[PDB]
């Protein structure tokens, strides 16, 4: 949709939606194993796990169902391997020791972090402030590396092997317009 | 009783049986506006019903007329209705013409009245199964005799029984309107019985119980130990939330205003030392000098004021206050701290809330006033959450301003000696002066009257007389009149506290209005506050003088 | 929603030429026509914010009577708060009768 | 498409198509079969939820009886309705974006359609309602502009499709616009059977694309995000080799 | 003697890097935005300083001139930490950052200033009547000797505790048999800041 050129990029709400559209692991509190009751019978998710769950056993559900159950008392989200101090430490060490390559980190970087911090405040094993500070440090370091790398902007192409979602989204318009103008100048010269 | 405390949860379950639905708002709550305990209970209930995802709606009302109109607006789809903070001392069936046979199906739509006033209607309890309430524990013991006559009265020598029943009913009636328990206390008892207690619930319970310190110190002293025990039962990281039992004093915004202004505006010190004339200020300066705090130091903000004397303040007070006899200013209270944001106390927070209720932002003007009151109530409600503090700093500064204005008017009143001492009850009327437009608010008028009655009590007079206070708004040409009961000195023993002083002003007003055709409008939920006409005031007063009180 | 909403943008619409006004009417005709065909189940003039939560707090902004919904009825008393489903009140919110999302 | 492995595969294809269309500077074809399945799916699911809700309502209103058990009753249908709302939002956004795009390039696609040598036909890129939208909107706008201004114009230049003189008035899409891509690789799980990919040191299968203006060759490996002009990448995109972001 | 300075600098750096409201580290973001636009300065609100810890506020209240330079160098340490990559080991054109305070204490009029306010933080207001022209002040001096002819650098802080506060020239040379103070000031390769004088009525 146009609505003042919203037809060219993604709004942060759409990014949050497209991230919460992802599977995650859960630790249920209740049981709904069939009598051996209502069928889940959704259209965009394997209902087999939903129908076949039993308490205190790990299983995989999409993110927003887990969030809805966490709004109730039928859920216990299991954090990924990132969200612990001893992994973020080696990660920040990797960024420090390699001043040219962005560290390996998925597209959903910092978004799952924001959502889990906002909702699942209590299920963590680590204090929240430590993790938030380390994530802030990672954000600052990657921001510095982005500014350092942006200095050279060829008119042909570029490679950004390990940028996450929001980092690409925020930078898309400026970069795109600058290279468009450069390409227009070069093509007009010929 | 209808619902004893030992069965409240069952009633809760009933709501889930009737109102818990998917796409139908089947629960509406009416709240007694311009009251703090009602607001605290409503917040607790809103949180609880947001937990189990029960759809609901909150409706503020001001007068019985609005209650009638909105009840007429209701639809049968509403299975359960809530009323909090009012509606205890009158029969709703005769009020809202409920036909028991219309609703029987059971009686369909249940109504839950939840109030505290003790002279509450006997028929409204024992005669109706449609209307049903939460007794605080009053019927099981106190009403052990009154219900017998009602049950009996619901061959020429049997008239003695009828006479005895009529006498018993009359003796039960003709008593003052009083409050003996807090709504939030019962709500928190239900929460504890269920198992949903936490820090927010404890904070709201503390607010509700401490909003009554001004007028019902007996209730406050009865209820304090439970709060203390409950808060005992339940490195400074930026997410600390600490509740503490710290010493605190009867001081107006001690932790947000300078200590000098705190002593100057504190009502108890005012009453004890007569600060409205020069000798009071001289004694205050003598007290400050003997304490040893400089007059330039004591006029600094509490944050920047010296750390060493901040630490030593307790010992300084202990060693100095004895000569002036103000040692009853020291008490034990609650303090809430949130990380690095700062510190706050219950008294300061409730004063901020009260001021925010007071100030914020013929028939048409009255409606406009009654609607801006509801708007201010909702603003105060939104101010509760911890995500907003700019709606609390404003409240604190407005509390400072309102207390200054009240003091400025009270000094003028006591200087002009407008307090006329009749044979039975004192009287004073604010015919003309400054800032009269502020006193159109009943709560502001009650604050002024509370200070006045404290000042009158803290004298050598040995007569406890009811006080009548009146105002004027030239736009409507009407007098707003409120009746006030006498109060004992705060530093008094409990032996002379067998029964709190009752309030007969509501009964006197209703009797005079029934026997004469005055142009009054009695619609406040507080039945001791009425509106009267300027030309009608004086004869009315005469009647009140000549009537039996 | 292609209804021009003269009851409640600009009030007079007099700042538009007559040709522009008839063009606007024709475009409203097309807008009404488009959703009447194969896409009747989906309102093309709905919201564009992705649905993120199911239960939200709603505070009244203007007074009215009572309004029915599916399986229930909402009475629009002046200046009250609702705890209702998100996917019911977006139409009213766009109309400007509800506030405090 | 020809057949569905599962409705979730259909949903993934729909979401990928929406993402591709949102950032594309050129109007892409129309995936009829996907929404053909999806609309029927939505109708059937809505019928089921309405039926079960009506059953609960009429068993509740015929007599008091027993209210539905709060467990396994509210949350399942809540999930169904919220998922349906989410899917409706996605489809609405896709359709509105396509409508805006066909708003922009109306005259260009109209002038392309009448070309006999043009192998691309307007029927495939657009749905029937989109065709009627285009033609009616074009006629309305032409009528408005003819009444307002062109009535006074001389015979020489009244036409609004002139392509002679100084400036042409047909807005071709900008094929050279720089876009963000993600090299997904071949859709097959083998991801090694394409006759296009090559290899470099340390393996790293890659595709070699060439730019005529710069007379260069650019290497694209799996798992790397690039910033490349749209013109050289149409074939890989339409073959689902690379996914835009 | 150095241990106290290290502890104080560490405490101030911990305050800068650890203070957060809601979900925002305010001062770090302020530093980033300031460095981006070449405004090497930071603003501290005194209420936050008091709320975070009271002992640091006490130390700032007791001896302002001795304490402020430690904070204004901890700031530049943090800025170097969070703006420049170590690259496993350049320009480094970052001078000492300026510290600016804001508070809401009780105003003190001009005539109430007396001997008891010496070396204390005070707040006051007035009217500006006359302004002097700008002037230069040295902060990093290159010093060269005549006989032994060696180079040295002197670092100058602009805060004065005692009236003198200045090491004019070191006595004797650094190690033969030079004079009392055979040093000269190398004007090139030095750093200078700007100073101005104002009058209040
Ligand atoms: Zn030498």
Curated annotation (Swiss-Prot), chain B:
Cellular component terms per the entry's GO annotation: CMG complex; DNA replication preinitiation complex; nuclear replication fork; nucleus
GO molecular function, one term: single-stranded DNA binding
Entry's Gene Ontology BP terms: DNA replication initiation; double-strand break repair via break-induced replication; mitotic DNA replication preinitiation complex assembly
Keywords: Cell cycle, DNA replication, Nucleus, Phosphoprotein
Protein task: Required for initiation of chromosomal DNA replication. Acts at the origin of replication. Also has a role in minichromosome maintenance.
Quaternary structure and interacting proteins, as annotated: Assembles into a complex with MCM5/CDC46. Interacts with MCM10.
Additional detail: Present with 1730 molecules/cell in log phase SD medium.
Protein's recorded name: Cell division control protein 45
Curated annotation (Swiss-Prot), chain C:
Other known facts: Present with 1431 molecules/cell in log phase SD medium.
Function: Required for DNA replication. Functions as part of the GINS complex which plays an essential role in the initiation of DNA replication by binding to DNA replication origins and facilitating the assembly of the DNA replication machinery. Required for the chromatin binding of CDC45.
Native organism: Saccharomyces cerevisiae (strain ATCC 204508 / S288c)
Subcellular location, record wording: Nucleus
Descriptive protein name: DNA replication complex GINS protein PSF1
Lineage of source species: Eukaryota, Fungi, Dikarya, Ascomycota, Saccharomycotina
Subunit structure: Component of the GINS complex which is a heterotetramer of SLD5, PSF1, PSF2 and PSF3. Interacts with PSF2.
Family note: Belongs to the GINS1/PSF1 family.
From Swiss-Prot, chain D:
Keyword Cytoplasm part of the UniProt annotation: no
Alphabetized UniProt keyword annotations: DNA replication, Nucleus
Compartments in which it is found: Nucleus
Gene Ontology CC terms, in alphabetical order: CMG complex; DNA replication preinitiation complex; GINS complex; nuclear replication fork; nucleus
GO biological process, one term: DNA-templated DNA replication
The keyword Ubl conjugation appears for this protein: no
Primary localisation category: nucleus
Outcome following mutation: residue 17 to P: Defective in DNA replication
Subunit structure of this chain's protein: Component of the GINS complex which is a heterotetramer composed of SLD5, PSF1, PSF2 and PSF3. Interacts with PSF2.
Function: Required for DNA replication. Functions as part of the GINS complex which plays an essential role in the initiation of DNA replication by binding to DNA replication origins and facilitating the assembly of the DNA replication machinery.
Family: Belongs to the GINS4/SLD5 family.
Name under which the protein is recorded: DNA replication complex GINS protein SLD5
UniProt organism field: Saccharomyces cerevisiae (strain ATCC 204508 / S288c) (Baker's yeast)
Curated annotation (Swiss-Prot), chain E:
Signal peptide: none
Subcellular location as annotated: Nucleus
Misc: Present with 10300 molecules/cell in log phase SD medium. Early fractionation of eukaryotic MCM proteins yielded a variety of dimeric, trimeric and tetrameric complexes with unclear biological significance. The MCM2-7 hexamer is the proposed physiological active complex.
Family, similarity comment: Belongs to the MCM family.
Function: Acts as a component of the MCM2-7 complex (MCM complex) which is the putative replicative helicase essential for 'once per cell cycle' DNA replication initiation and elongation in eukaryotic cells. The active ATPase sites in the MCM2-7 ring are formed through the interaction surfaces of two neighboring subunits such that a critical structure of a conserved arginine finger motif is provided in trans relative to the ATP-binding site of the Walker A box of the adjacent subunit.
Complex and partners: Component of the MCM2-7 complex. The complex forms a toroidal hexameric ring with the proposed subunit order MCM2-MCM6-MCM4-MCM7-MCM3-MCM5; loaded onto DNA, forms a head-head double hexamer. Interacts with CSM1.
Protein name: Minichromosome maintenance protein 5
Gene of this entry: MCM5
């Amino acid at each position: 949709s146009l609505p003042a050129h919203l037809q060219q990029t993604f709004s942060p709400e759409e990014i949050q939606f497209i991230v919460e559209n992802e599977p995650i692991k859960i630790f249920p509190r209740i049981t709904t194993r069939q009598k051996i009751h209502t069928r889940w019978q959704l259209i965009t998710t394997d209902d087999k796990a939903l129908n076949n769950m039993v308490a205190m056993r790990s299983t995989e559900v999409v993110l927003w169902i887990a969030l809805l159950l966490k709004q109730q008392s039928k859920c216990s989200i299991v954090a990924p391997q990132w969200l612990t101090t001893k992994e973020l430490d080696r990660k920040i060490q990797y960024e420090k020791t390699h001043p040219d390559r962005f560290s390996e980190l998925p597209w959903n970087w910092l978004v799952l972090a924001r959502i889990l911090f906002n909702k699942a405040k209590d299920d963590f094993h680590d204090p929240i402030h430590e993790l938030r500070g380390k994530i802030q440090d990672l954000r600052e370091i990657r921001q510095i590396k982005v500014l350092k790398g942006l200095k050279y902007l060829n008119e042909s192409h570029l490679q950004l092997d390990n940028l996450s979602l929001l980092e690409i989204n925020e930078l898309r318009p400026f970069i795109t317009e600058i290279m468009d103008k450069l390409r227009e100048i070069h093509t007009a010269s010929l | 009783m209808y619902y004893g405390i030992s069965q409240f949860s069952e009633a809760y379950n009933k709501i889930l049986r009737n109102s818990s639905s998917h796409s139908s708002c089947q629960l509406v709550i009416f709240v007694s506006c311009l009251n703090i305990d009602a607001l605290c209970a409503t917040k607790m209930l809103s949180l609880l019903f947001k937990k189990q995802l029960v759809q609901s709606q909150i409706v503020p009302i001001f007068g019985y007329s609005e209650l009638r109109r909105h009840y007429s607006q209701l639809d049968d789809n509403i299975n359960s209705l809530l009323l909090v903070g009012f509606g205890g001392v009158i029969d709703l069936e005769a009020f809202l013409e409920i036909d028991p046979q219309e609703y029987v199906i059971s009686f369909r739509r249940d109504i839950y009245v939840l109030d505290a006033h003790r002279p509450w209607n006997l028929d409204n309890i024992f005669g109706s199964q449609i209307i049903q309430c939460f007794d605080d524990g009053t019927v099981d013991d106190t009403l052990g005799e009154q219900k017998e006559a009602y049950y009996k009265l619901l061959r020429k020598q049997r008239k003695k029984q009828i006479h005895e029943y009529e006498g018993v009913l009359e003796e039960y009636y003709s008593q003052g309107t009083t409050v003996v328990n807090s709504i939030s206390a019962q709500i928190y008892s239900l929460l504890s019985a269920i198992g949903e207690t936490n820090l927010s619930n404890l904070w709201l319970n503390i607010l509700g119980t401490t909003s009554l310190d001004i007028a019902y110190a007996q209730v406050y002293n009865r209820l304090y130990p439970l709060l203390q025990d409950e808060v005992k039962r339940l490195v400074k990281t930026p997410d600390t939330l600490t509740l503490n039992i710290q010493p605190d004093y009867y001081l107006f915004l001690l932790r947000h205003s300078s200590l000098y202004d705190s002593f100057y505006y504190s009502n108890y010190v005012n009453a004890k030392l007569s600060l409205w004339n020069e000798n009071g200020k001289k004694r205050l300066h003598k007290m400050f000098a003997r304490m040893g705090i400089p007059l330039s130091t004591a006029q600094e903000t509490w944050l920047y004021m010296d750390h060493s004397i901040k630490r030593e303040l307790g010992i300084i007070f202990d060693k100095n206050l004895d000569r002036y006899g103000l040692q009853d200013i020291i008490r034990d209270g609650f303090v809430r701290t949130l990380g690095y944001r700062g510190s706050i106390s219950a008294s300061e927070f409730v004063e901020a809330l009260t001021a925010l209720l007071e100030v914020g932002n013929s028939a048409q003007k009255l409606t406009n006033l009654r609607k801006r009151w509801v708007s201010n109530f909702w603003l105060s409600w939104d101010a509760l959450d911890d995500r907003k503090v700019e709606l609390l700093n404003r409240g604190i500064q407005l509390a400072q301003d309102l207390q200054r204005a009240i003091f400025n008017t009270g000094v003028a009143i006591l200087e002009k000696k407008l307090i006329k001492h009749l044979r039975i009850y004192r009287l004073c009327v604010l015919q003309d002066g400054p800032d009269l437009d502020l006193y159109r608010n009943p709560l502001t008028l009650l604050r002024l009257g509370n200070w006045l009655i404290e000042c009158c009590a803290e004298s050598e007079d040995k007569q406890l007389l009811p006080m009548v206070l009146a105002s004027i708004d030239e736009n409507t040409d009407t007098y707003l009149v409120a009746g006030l009961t006498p109060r004992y000195p705060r530093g008094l023993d409990t032996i002379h506290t067998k029964k709190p002083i009752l309030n007969n002003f509501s009964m006197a007003f209703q009797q005079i209005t029934a026997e004469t055709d005055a142009k009054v409008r009695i619609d406040n939920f507080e039945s001791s506050i009425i509106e009267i006409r300027r030309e009608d005031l004086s004869p009315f007063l005469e009647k009140l003088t000549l009537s039996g009180l | 929603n292609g209804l021009d909403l003269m009851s409640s943008s600009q009030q007079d619409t007099n700042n538009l030429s007559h040709q522009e006004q008839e063009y606007l009417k024709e475009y409203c005709d097309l807008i009404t026509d488009l959703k009447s065909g194969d896409l009747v189940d989906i309102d093309l003039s709905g919201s564009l914010v992705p649905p993120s939560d199911v239960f939200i707090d709603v505070r009244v902004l203007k007074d009215a009577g009572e309004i029915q919904t599916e399986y229930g009825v909402f009475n629009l008393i002046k200046d009250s708060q609702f705890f209702v489903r998100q996917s019911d009140v977006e139409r009213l919110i766009q109309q400007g009768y509800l506030q405090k999302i | 498409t020809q057949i569905y492995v599962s409705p979730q595969q259909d949903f993934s294809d729909l979401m990928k198509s929406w993402k591709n269309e949102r950032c594309s500077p050129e109007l892409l074809p129309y995936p009829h079969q996907l929404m053909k399945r999806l609309l029927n799916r939505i109708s059937m699911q809505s019928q089921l939820i309405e039926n079960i809700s009506m059953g609960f309502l009429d068993m509740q209103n015929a007599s008091n009886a027993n209210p539905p058990m709060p467990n396994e009753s509210k949350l399942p249908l809540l999930c169904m309705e919220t998922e349906l709302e989410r899917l409706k939002f996605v489809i609405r956004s896709y359709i509105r974006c396509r409508l805006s795009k066909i708003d922009k390039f109306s005259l260009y696609l109209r002038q392309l359609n009448e070309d006999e040598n043009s192998l691309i036909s307007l029927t495939d890129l657009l749905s029937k309602d989109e065709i009627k939208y285009h033609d009616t909107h074009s006629l309305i706008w032409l009528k408005l502009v003819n009444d307002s201004i062109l009535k006074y114009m001389p015979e020489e230049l009244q036409a609004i499709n002139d392509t002679e003189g100084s400036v042409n008035m047909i807005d071709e899409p900008d094929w050279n616009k720089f876009v963000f891509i993600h090299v997904n690789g071949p859709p097959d799980g083998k991801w090694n059977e394409d006759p296009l990919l090559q290899e470099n040191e340390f393996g790293k299968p890659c595709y070699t694309v060439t730019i005529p203006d710069l007379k260069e060759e650019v290497e694209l490996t799996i798992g790397s995000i690039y910033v490349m002009r749209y013109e050289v990448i149409r074939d890989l995109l339409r073959d689902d080799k690379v996914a835009l972001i | 003697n150095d241990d106290d300075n290290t502890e104080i600098i560490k405490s101030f750096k911990n305050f800068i890097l650890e203070f957060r409201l809601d979900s925002q580290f305010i001062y770090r973001d302020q530093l980033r935005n300031n460095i981006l636009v070449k405004n090497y300065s930071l603003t501290v609100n005194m209420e936050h300083l008091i709320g975070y810890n009271e002992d640091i506020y006490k130390k700032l209240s007791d001896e302002p001139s001795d304490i402020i330079p430690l904070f204004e160098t901890a700031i530049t340490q943090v800025a170097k930490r969070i703006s420049i990559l170590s690259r496993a080991q350049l320009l480094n054109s970052l001078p000492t950052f300026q510290l600016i305070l804001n508070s809401n204490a009780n105003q003190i009029p001009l005539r109430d200033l007396d001997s008891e306010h010496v070396s204390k933080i005070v707040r006051l207001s007035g009217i500006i009547i006359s302004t002097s022209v700008l002037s230069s002040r040295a902060t990093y001096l290159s010093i060269m000797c005549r006989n032994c002819r060696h180079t040295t650098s002197i670092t100058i802080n602009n805060f004065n505790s005692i009236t003198g506060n200045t090491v004019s020239l070191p006595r004797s040379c650094l190690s033969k048999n030079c004079g009392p103070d055979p040093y000269i000031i190398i004007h090139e390769s030095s750093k200078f800041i700007d100073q101005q004088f104002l009058k209040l009525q």
